[PDB]
Design a protein around this nucleic acid. Sequence first.
RNA 1: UGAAAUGGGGUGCCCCCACCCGUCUUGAAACACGGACCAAGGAGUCAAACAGACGCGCAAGGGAGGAGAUAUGGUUGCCAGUACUUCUCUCGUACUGAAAGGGAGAUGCAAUAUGCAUCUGUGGUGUGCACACGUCAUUUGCCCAACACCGACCGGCCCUGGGUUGCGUUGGAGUGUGCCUGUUUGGACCCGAAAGGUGGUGAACUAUGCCUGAACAAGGUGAAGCCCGGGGAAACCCAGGUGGAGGCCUGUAGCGAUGCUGACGUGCAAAUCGCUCGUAUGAUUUGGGUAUCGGAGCGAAAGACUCAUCGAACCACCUAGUAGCUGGUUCACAUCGAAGUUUCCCUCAGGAUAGCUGGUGCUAGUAGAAGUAUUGUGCGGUAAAGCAA
RNA 2: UGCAAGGCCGGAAAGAAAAGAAUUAGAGGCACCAAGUGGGCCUUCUUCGGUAAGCGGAGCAGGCGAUGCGGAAUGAACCGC
RNA 3: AGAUGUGGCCUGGAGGUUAGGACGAAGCUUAUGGCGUGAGCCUAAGAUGGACCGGCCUCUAGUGCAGAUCUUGGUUGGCGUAGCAAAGAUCUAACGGAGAUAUACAACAUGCAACGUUGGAUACUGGAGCGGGGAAGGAUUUCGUGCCAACGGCACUCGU
RNA 4: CCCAACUGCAGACCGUACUCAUCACCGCAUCAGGUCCCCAAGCAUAGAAUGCUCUGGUACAUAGAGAAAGGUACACUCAGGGAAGUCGGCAAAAUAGAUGCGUAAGUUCGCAAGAAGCAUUGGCUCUGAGGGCAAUUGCCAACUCAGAACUGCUUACGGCGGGGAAUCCAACUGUAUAAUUAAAACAUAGGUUUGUGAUGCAUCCAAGUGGUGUAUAUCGCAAACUGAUUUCUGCCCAGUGCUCUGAAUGUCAACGUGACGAGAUUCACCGACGCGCGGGUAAACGGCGGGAGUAACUAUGACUCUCUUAAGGUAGCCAAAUGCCUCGUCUUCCAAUUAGAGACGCGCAUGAAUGGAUUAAUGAGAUUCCCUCUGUCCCGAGUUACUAUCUAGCGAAACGACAGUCAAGGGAACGGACUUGAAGGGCUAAGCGGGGAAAGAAGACCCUGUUGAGUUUGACUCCAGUCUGGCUCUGUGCGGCGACGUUGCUUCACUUAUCGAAUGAAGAGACCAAUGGGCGUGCUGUAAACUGAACCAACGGGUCCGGAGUCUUGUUUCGAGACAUCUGCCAGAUGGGGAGUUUGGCUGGGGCGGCAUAUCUGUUACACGACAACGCAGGUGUCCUAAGGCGAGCUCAGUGGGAACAGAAAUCUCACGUAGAACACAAGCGUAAAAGCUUGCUUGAUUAACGAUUUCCAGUACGAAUCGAGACUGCGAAAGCAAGGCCAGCGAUCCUUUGCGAAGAAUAGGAAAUAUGAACAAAUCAUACCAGAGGUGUCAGAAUAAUUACCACAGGGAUAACUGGCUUGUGGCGGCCAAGCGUUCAUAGCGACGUCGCUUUUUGAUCCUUCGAUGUCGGCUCUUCCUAACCUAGCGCCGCAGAAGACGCUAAGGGUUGGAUUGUUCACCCACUGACAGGGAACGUGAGCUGGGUUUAGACCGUCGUGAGACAGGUUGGUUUUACCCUACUUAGCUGGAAAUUGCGAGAA
RNA 5: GUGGUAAUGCGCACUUGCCAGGUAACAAAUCAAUCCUCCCACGGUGAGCUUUCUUUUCACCAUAAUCCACUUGGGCCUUUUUACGCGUUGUUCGGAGCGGGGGCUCAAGAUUGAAAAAUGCAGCUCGUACUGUGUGAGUUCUGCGCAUUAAAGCAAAAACCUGGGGUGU
Length: 252
Amino acid sequence: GKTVLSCRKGNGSVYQVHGHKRLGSAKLRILDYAERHGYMRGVVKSIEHEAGRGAALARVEFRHPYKFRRVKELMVAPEGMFTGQSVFCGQKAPLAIGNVLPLGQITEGCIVCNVEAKPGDRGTLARASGDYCIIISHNHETGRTRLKLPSGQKKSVPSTSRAMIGIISGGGRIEKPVLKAGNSFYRFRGKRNCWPKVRGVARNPVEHPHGGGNHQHIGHPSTVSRHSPPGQKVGLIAARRTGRIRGGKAVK
RNA sequence: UGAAAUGGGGUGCCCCCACCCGUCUUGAAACACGGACCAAGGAGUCAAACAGACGCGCAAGGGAGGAGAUAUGGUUGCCAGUACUUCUCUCGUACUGAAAGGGAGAUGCAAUAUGCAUCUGUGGUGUGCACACGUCAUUUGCCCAACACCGACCGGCCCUGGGUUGCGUUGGAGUGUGCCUGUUUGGACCCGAAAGGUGGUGAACUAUGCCUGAACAAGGUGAAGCCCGGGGAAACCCAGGUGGAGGCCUGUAGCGAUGCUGACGUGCAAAUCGCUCGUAUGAUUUGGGUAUCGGAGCGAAAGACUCAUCGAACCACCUAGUAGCUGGUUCACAUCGAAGUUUCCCUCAGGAUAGCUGGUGCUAGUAGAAGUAUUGUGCGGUAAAGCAA
RNA sequence: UGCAAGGCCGGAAAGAAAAGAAUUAGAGGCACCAAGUGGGCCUUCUUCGGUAAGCGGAGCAGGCGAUGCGGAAUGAACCGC
RNA sequence: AGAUGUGGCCUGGAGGUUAGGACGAAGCUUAUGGCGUGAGCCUAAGAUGGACCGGCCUCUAGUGCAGAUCUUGGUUGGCGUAGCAAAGAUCUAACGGAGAUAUACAACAUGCAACGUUGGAUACUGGAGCGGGGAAGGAUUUCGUGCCAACGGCACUCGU
RNA sequence: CCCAACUGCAGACCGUACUCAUCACCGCAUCAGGUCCCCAAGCAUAGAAUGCUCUGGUACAUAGAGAAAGGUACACUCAGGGAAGUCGGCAAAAUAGAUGCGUAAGUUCGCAAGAAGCAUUGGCUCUGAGGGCAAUUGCCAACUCAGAACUGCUUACGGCGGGGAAUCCAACUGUAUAAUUAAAACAUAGGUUUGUGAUGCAUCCAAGUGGUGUAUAUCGCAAACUGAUUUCUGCCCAGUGCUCUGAAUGUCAACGUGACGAGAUUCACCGACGCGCGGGUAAACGGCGGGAGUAACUAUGACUCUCUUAAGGUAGCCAAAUGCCUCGUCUUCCAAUUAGAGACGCGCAUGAAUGGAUUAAUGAGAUUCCCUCUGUCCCGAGUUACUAUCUAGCGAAACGACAGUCAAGGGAACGGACUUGAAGGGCUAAGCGGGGAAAGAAGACCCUGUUGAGUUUGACUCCAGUCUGGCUCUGUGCGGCGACGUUGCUUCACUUAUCGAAUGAAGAGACCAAUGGGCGUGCUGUAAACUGAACCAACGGGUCCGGAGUCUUGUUUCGAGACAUCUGCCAGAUGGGGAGUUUGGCUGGGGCGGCAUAUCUGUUACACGACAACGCAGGUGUCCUAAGGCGAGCUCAGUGGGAACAGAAAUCUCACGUAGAACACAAGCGUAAAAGCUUGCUUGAUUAACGAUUUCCAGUACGAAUCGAGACUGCGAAAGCAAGGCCAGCGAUCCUUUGCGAAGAAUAGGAAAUAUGAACAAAUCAUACCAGAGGUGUCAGAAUAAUUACCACAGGGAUAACUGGCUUGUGGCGGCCAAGCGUUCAUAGCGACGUCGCUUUUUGAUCCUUCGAUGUCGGCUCUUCCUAACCUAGCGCCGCAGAAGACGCUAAGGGUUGGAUUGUUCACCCACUGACAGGGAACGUGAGCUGGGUUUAGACCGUCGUGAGACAGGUUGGUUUUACCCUACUUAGCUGGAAAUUGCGAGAA
RNA sequence: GUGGUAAUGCGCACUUGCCAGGUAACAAAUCAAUCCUCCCACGGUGAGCUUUCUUUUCACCAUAAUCCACUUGGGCCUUUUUACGCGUUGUUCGGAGCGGGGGCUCAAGAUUGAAAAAUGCAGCUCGUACUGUGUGAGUUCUGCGCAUUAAAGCAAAAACCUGGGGUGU
């Protein structure tokens, strides 16, 4: 029959990021010679809001290390980062909220956000509003640093990786009930075409494996194998557990 | 020499007779289906393989095909024909075995794991045109064709002289062509599907996202914050204003489309109209641009929608798709004239097969005659009877 | 020289008497090619299932189907033909 | 149902043969008869036609129609019938125009209805307009003169 | 050369009309549909509502005459009653603006709410209050509100809510089947679960250093389920899924390795994910029991026992949209209640995110009562515009074999035509909807077809995707385990292949020097932060070199690294995500059942043979080295007399014993010194040269059988008997597979040696010829699961669902006889056991007509007919005193009701009445209506199914088209005519 | 280049060598409200009505671009110090400088002139000359944004502009 809707999102026709009103990507400053052997000092020129992001971004204005010009970097602001602040980024940079240190220089148990999982990555992780890592221990022989992240899993990043001290801006967002279909409207408007979402048992059998009839019901177990082909994987994909978690929630 | 007369023709009438055609059908005048009129079109063809009738040539031989050669090395043409030709090719004269291989006459003598001689001859027997010599239709002779019973001989396989086996022989009958009928495949007598396949065109209708513009009369209710006063030991609690919140209410435009099961229902209209009704600051309505489409698109999900087409669009093609199914199938007269049963089939609306039927016949016109008697001789367990067997 | 068989050669042959003691619009026999049909239905008599049926299923035959014509006012099949 | 026969009827053509025709060929029409059981043939008449064509033997095929919800063209009864009923509606005078005031012992009883423009009357739209300007789409519909064949489902003298 | 104010010259290209719509565009057209933007007057009024009007623009939509019925309406009214109408208050009426007072239960405290309800309102003449400005005083604008006196109402434009008591469902706004469904369905907020740290999860993609979520980073992204709040979410991990291990040693492919052999071939071992084993998981798919006894009357069973499961439905809830029985039972509502509400619960078949229970507000959702109101109704009547009607102009289509009056008969069983009768003069205008089994559309229902299509899965057959193994990519060094110096594997340290990332490839490494080659580590600045500036060298040294270290066995840098998510091929597992196709037949329609599909005995079967049914009564797929073969001896079932225990029944004995026994089995037939029984010896149950024949039949095959000829035999003295057990017990082509063709000889292929691999020859291998086996049971022999209510096509009345026809079991109605009832007395009135009929208002049975179509329940309306008579008329009879009534006769002229509940027909109750009789007319009556029911597409529940989906269960919503033709009928005109038009053919109530 | 304590005023140069920032650039509701429309007031010209009434009813009364020289609202400076005071219809503000005096600047106007009456309109005269020329209801231009609910925070770039630095030196 017809192709499932989870497969049609894979074309990217209507379902792409909207992202027009967005300001561009948010990254840490480039890793330079100064970044590695010293620190570069900028100043926070503003704090604003991407459409479709829950955090709060920052235009931080460094001076160009080489030519005569002034470069503006856009990074995800920590919690108490205020306009006019001076942000230090580099190896010599002191340990303070918003400064960016190489993650091997930071104490033992510090709170860290916006980590880069690869030394030059300009940060990929702990970037979502309110989220932070916890760096655990530095391994001085192998040159690694172990840290938990937000999902509870504990990873090991090469300690030349950089990091930004302090939790991410937004906080909450989630703790507040939406209350109406209406507030969910511009919710995703800045994000994607995710919504509203018809559940599978309602739609006809061509379109979905759940597409049954007399009584809305799946008719066959909803847990699906890992090796199931696209258009078949639907519902709970290789579930180890199912139903209420009564005690436990081991990190997934 | 104008007429008379018989026949044919026309129109009306009387007595009488008389259901509407084609069709499927056990059964049609049917309340079974096609059917207003006419003109002009309109359906067993062409090709190939095989066969049997019938016409023709030739005959243990027949016949080419392709090409060549000249009259023609000519002629606008009549000539793309006719005339001519061979070694070959091919169907035959011989068949048999899985194959290696083998491979056919008669008579006499005669029995020799290849016997020997002769060569004017049906291998023998029964039945059998014509002919011949007789006889009162028929005796004998030879018997042609042909039917039947046998033997011999060739090939296979055999038992131990015998069994059998071939689409074998036993003084050849083929071959070429015409024509007809019947199989067969091809569009295949003509018209007819729901479908299937390759390749293109569509988001002007409509689904959804995005860029950038536009729009929402008049009222009702009266959230936060703010201002004044009152109460209280405190904490806080009461009252009057202001303020103008909401996928809030009434109500235009707008966007919709509930009820009349109203009008209309060969319309104003291939979905419209009238009053009534839903919502009308929001998940709102809307213009232009732009993005995602065919086993795919998009979907607040109804199999919705994708240009009057959607449980798989549109266009051209494969495609005159296949149909055991429905419909049609155009001149006359004459001689004849059925079947719905048997057996087998994924067979039961169909076929093949025997039967019924026609055509061509062959054969010495009473033969091997009979849906019937009589005589003789066999067979039998129904009707009746019996339960005192 | 009995019996089996294939013959040969002779014999006779109301060509089948008499007894009711046959009859025939009795040319026998063989062959090739091929069509249509393979839904039937009705009736005397026999007949099975059914309460029965203008029901269902057979037997021996005759009809309609395919065929009118005369008759039973009318009727596929009855009666006569 | 089916099989076959015919010195058996018709049709377009090819090989032959024998004829016809401007003194009238094919075609066409007829209460035109004659012949054949029949398909059909043949003659007569045309106050039809205007140039081709018949018989007979043989060959040949895109060769014979009443029926397919057959194809195409035409016609036809139904029938001067259904109907031409949303958006209120027109009236009068003078002038235009072929469209009249149209007559073999007065005028009505014997030329009906309808058209345009101007003036007057009455009425509708009722500023979310049968008001004035643009996009999409159309592309000469705009404008003046002439004009009424067809076209504006009635009518025009008016008109896109 | 720049700047400033002037001046001089030049200023190109394309569109430009008109239209933007009741005529300029799209809708076949000048079509009541659709189509973006701008400007927008006066008065009433809250006003862009609605009504009228000045500017602008129009009089174009075919008209005229005009009182028929019937209609349509953006038109009204109605005495008395007031929902009795009806499926149902459908439609209409009703309510109504503003101001003041007033306002319930319930509640998420927001509402409910305009709840409900009461009252005021005009006109006129006055009065008060509400301000600005200028220097207490002076001058002025624009409106609103309140109060009073007088006076009036015919309650009087437009516009503008009826309201209340409850149940079911969804929380709400929203979306949603363009053109039959607007809902309870979808969405939603809220809840939960699953995958996932980027070399990732989901996933597009034929393919790439390809693409999407991702401009992202667990408060994220992806995939499901549930559907606000409140209150809760119980038990089951056996099954099917998903998943996790290792202590998972079984099994599975290729490669890899080794061995016999001349070799192909062959064999052994090694060999992953998966499967198996072992766990986990239900807000994964789902599931959640029976029987008996027992308490001081009875009834119930807290309580015992018992069977049994993975667990035995917990909290709740209910004849509810889920309850068959069922119109459940009780209470309430009403005169009356198949409806509604509240209860009850052994619940056919309620139940917990397949969500349970509640739930204020909300609803073009479903239902029931109440007030108000009414032409819905009793019961209809009058008026209006536009029609129809007549006219002027214009002018179609549907349809059409031919046609058109009936009754009865038969017929294809429901005629316009035929048969026998009764009507019938012709032509016409408006109506009407009985008929033309009227018109539309090659029945959509049903069956059939060796036709499909959409979906589903545990079908058959495969394909992508995902995973897994091997080789490869693929390098270097010291080693460790193995194997027979080499090689398999492998730890670790490396870096150039390769992979991941970043950067404008922007500063690597070294100098600090070895296992190399021929102090510190590139270093002005900061140490919580709280917005300044920095460029195009100053300068030093001899135009160069510094300032600004030099060097390069060389990567742009970082991470990983010979690994895998790298590359390619080979190999397996998974795999409805996707493809192709299939999903027997017969059949008193199909389905379910059966087997009448291949078959054997008796019967039907009609004294040869043959003969049907889903006719009757039974069998077959096997069993037997003896139950086969043979010779010999014997006699069986049973009965009777007699014999220790010992009897009805043990064993012995005698007599009788026509088979009454037996023979593997169904049945039939046959058999007595046997064909039975006992016993002996045995393998005729082998081979049998291609013999013939029967049975079925086409005179084909198969199966089975009969008669033979040959070989070697068995038993018997012998004659003879035996090639299985008589007769049912079974199998094509192709393919696979086994047996026979031993050795030896032949001077040559013969009488006698099996042939082939085709240029020869050997040994393998393969094949051939002959006879057997592996099997098709649908048995003359395909390889095969579902659903369609989203459905399609070709046809069928060869075949179901209506009517009609035959039949009448069944239903209904009646007769005959007379056992008995009736205290008595068969028959006043009844009438058993029997028995004979009728009717066609029941249901069957059949399948004759109709499938290129006869509109398929009930009510309303309307007419007519029948009589088996309820009332009405007349009468007989009685267990008839009267009154009331029973039974019967003639008789169908007349009459036969108002309601509650139900879609109902049927049924029940209320009420009236002289009575509330039973029926027919295509189960009369849909171009007459209505559309509640059934019978579609949407949707919910229960039960069933893994699933799509089903249900003759429940529920809500779901288009009702055409008449102008012919006849009929109802009225309305014209007009001939007696030889019924002519003949002159002549008849006087 | 140059004045003012200052907000900033006045008209030798070049700067797209380079850099930095602005304009372009987007935003509810309430209140006030521009052009303009309507209505009223004043009264000039013609017309309508007239039996009666109506100092009456109707129409018109206009000034384009361009360029010159008091009011309202905001930002700000100096001065005197304020901790209760200023202010809106309105949810405010101040020692990080309220209020008062005096000033600077910006936005929207008003006013007087250039254009410009030579035009337009109406009336009238014998195809001409003359005559005439509001504290009201609407109104989105504007005040007005770091500006709306917001798990919604509301495009970008040419082109221009000023400055930094420099050139002139």
